[PDB]
Amino acid sequence: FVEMVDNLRGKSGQGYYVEMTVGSPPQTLNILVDTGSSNFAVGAAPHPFLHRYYQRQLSSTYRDLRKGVYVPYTQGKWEGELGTDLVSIPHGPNVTVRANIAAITESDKFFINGSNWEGILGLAYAEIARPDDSLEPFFDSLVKQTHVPNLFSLQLCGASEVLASVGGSMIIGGIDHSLYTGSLWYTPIRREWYYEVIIVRVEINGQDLKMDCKEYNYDKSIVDSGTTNLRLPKKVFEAAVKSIKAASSTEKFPDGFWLGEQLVCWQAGTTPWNIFPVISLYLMGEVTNQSFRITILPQQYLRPVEDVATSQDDCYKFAISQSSTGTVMGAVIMEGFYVVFDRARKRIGFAVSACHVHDEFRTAAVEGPFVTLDMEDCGYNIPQTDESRSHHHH
Numbered sequence: 094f095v096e097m098v099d100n101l102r103g104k105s106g107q108g109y110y111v112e113m114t115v116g117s118p119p120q121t122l123n124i125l126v127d128t129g130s131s132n133f134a135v136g137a138a139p140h141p142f143l144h145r146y147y148q149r150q151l152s153s154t155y156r157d158l159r160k161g162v163y164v165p166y167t168q169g170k171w172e173g174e175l176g177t178d179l180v181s182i183p184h185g186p187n188v189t190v191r192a193n194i195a196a197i198t199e200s201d202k203f204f205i206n207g208s209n210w211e212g213i214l215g216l217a218y219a220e221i222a223r224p225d226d227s228l229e230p231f232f233d234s235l236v237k238q239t240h241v242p243n244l245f246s247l248q249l250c251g252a253s254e255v256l257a258s259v260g261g262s263m264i265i266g267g268i269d270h271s272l273y274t275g276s277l278w279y280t281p282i283r284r285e286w287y288y289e290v291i292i293v294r295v296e297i298n299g300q301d302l303k304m305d306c307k308e309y310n311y312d313k314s315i316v317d318s319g320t321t322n323l324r325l326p327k328k329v330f331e332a333a334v335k336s337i338k339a340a341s342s343t344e345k346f347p348d349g350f351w352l353g354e355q356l357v358c359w360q361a362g363t364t365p366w367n368i369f370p371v372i373s374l375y376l377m378g379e380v381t382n383q384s385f386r387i388t389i390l391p392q393q394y395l396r397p398v399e400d401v402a403t404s405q406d407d408c409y410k411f412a413i414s415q416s417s418t419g420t421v422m423g424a425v426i427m428e429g430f431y432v433v434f435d436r437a438r439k440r441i442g443f444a445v446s447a448c449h450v451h452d453e454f455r456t457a458a459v460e461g462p463f464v465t466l467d468m469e470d471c472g473y474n475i476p477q478t479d480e481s482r483s484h485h486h487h
């Protein structure tokens with residue numbers, strides 16, 4: 094798995110991308126690794142934020158599916174013509190694959206200036222692929238076409254005129270034991286659509302938020318690599334901030350900081366991480382009654398930003414934000430750990446990363462088991478609308 098080690102690059106808060114080549118002869122692109130979508134979509138026309146793009150015309154292997162695709166997220170929209178081509182991950186498994194490609198012809202607030210990515214690699218399930226579940230996702234194609242085991246793991250690692258460079262690893266087909274320390278704990282994938290988990294309990298410096306666990310998973314809890322922040326639902330974010338503020342009461346920060354719209358600065362290397370609390374998310378274990386906690390350090394939820402003016406100071410952005418689409422375990426969470434997407438066994442494993450950011454007093458931890466007798470169902474049931482009820486799947 095060494096050839097796959099350090100295969101992810103990127104800028105802080107703009108995403109982790111993997112180099113892929115599309116077509117015959119292979120056109121090389123930088124593709125955003127995203128676990129909260131199921132589409133393999135690439136820039137196929139000029140755009141001001143696009144250095145290069147996919148040119149179908151120059152591929153002997155390109156096939157037009159004579160069908161269009163339109164994908165609007167809550168933050169971003171893209172659209173294009175669907176087809177298939179030969180896809181390969183240079184610094185991934187030594188395999189070439191015939192995959193569905195969505196050639197992005199028009200987009201809106203999707204591509205990021207200087208992010209260095211020309212497309213998206215939707216690693217989630219068919220159940221969320223567009224225009225429907227019959228459009229086979231890349232990973233699904235990779236497994237059906239090769240002998241590649243139905244699993245992948247991500248090791249996302251953190252970090253003055255440009256943003257700070259990020260590194261990381263995408264291991265397709267297995268687990269790399271040198272990427273983690275300690276035990277690898279698993280949480281069931283609730284449903285195969287998004288990589289859905291169930292958070293059963295939350296604690297800020299040991300102090301339980303004391304909320305009804307369904308609120309932690311309202312309306313869903315997902316693991317998304319294409320999200321920078323730990324996005325929580327309105328009620329949970331409110332409780333979390335009230336608590337974080339309480340532990341960091343010695344120093345008073347502006348309101349714009351908690352809304353993640355402003356930095357806070359301390360003289361180089363004088364940052365008081367000690368005054369900041371740990372967030373422990375308790376995830377539902379493989380055994381019913383059982384759970385394990387993933388502990389996150391202020392070094393994860395406080396993203397550093399080196400401002401051109403305040404270059405002599407260490408400035409940070411509060412990387413916990415509000416969400417209406419549920420809890421999102423983005424890069425903030427992921428950076429501390431080695432995350433295993435064990436699709437084969439319908440589960441997600443976490444272990445302490447061999448690359449995470451920490452201080453001499455505290456360390457990001459994966460600990461368990463924690464038993465809870467007569468524990469309620471923490472998962473939420475999304476009201477079934479007439480649009481979702483109308484659908485047919487054979």
Ligand SMILES: O=C(O[C@H]1CCS(=O)(=O)c2ccc(Br)cc21)[C@H]1C[C@]2(CN1)C(=O)Nc1ccccc12
Pocket residue numbers: 125127128129130131165166167168169202203204213221222223317318319320418
């Ligand atoms: O979670 C995700 O997508 C979800 C978001 C909630 S949603 O409900 O807007 C939605 C809808 C359909 C699909 Br497929 C995925 C998603 C994906 C898409 C995501 C982040 N990760 C994004 O939201 N903007 C953006 C912009 C550039 C690159 C990636 C993204």
